[PDB]
């Protein structure tokens, strides 16, 4: 089912749609087609989801 990624650099959500992430975190990439710039991700460990800037995520 799930496309995976690894977070490269810390990012703090500034808007309610965004997801705060830490360098090294594992995510699921829920969508990367609506925008090359904003990907919807879900943290494996917490289950929280939101948008992150795409350059913060390295697909696995």
Tell me the number of residues near Na ion by CB under 5 A.
Answer: 2
Distance in angstroms (rounded) separating the CA atoms of residues 22 and 30: 18
Residue nearest to Pt ion (CB): 12
Contacts of 3 (CB under 8 A, 6+ apart): 28, 29, 32, 59
Query: Residue 36 binds which entry of Na ion, Pt ion, none, with Cβ cut-offs from 5 to 8 Å by kind?
Result: Na ion
**Residues 17-56: x where in contact with Na ion by CB under 5 A, - otherwise, as a string:** ---------------x---x--------------------
Q: Taking the complex as a whole, how short is the minimal distance between the CB of residue 3 and Pt ion, in angstroms?
A: 27
């Amino acid at each position: 089912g799930m496309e995976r990624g690894i977070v490269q650099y810390d990012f703090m959500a500034e808007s309610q749609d965004e997801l705060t992430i830490k360098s090294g975190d594992k995510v699921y990439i829920l969508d990367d087609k609506k925008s090359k710039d904003w990907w919807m991700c879900q943290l494996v460990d917490s289950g929280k989801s939101g948008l992150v800037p795409a350059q913060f995520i390295e697909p696995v």
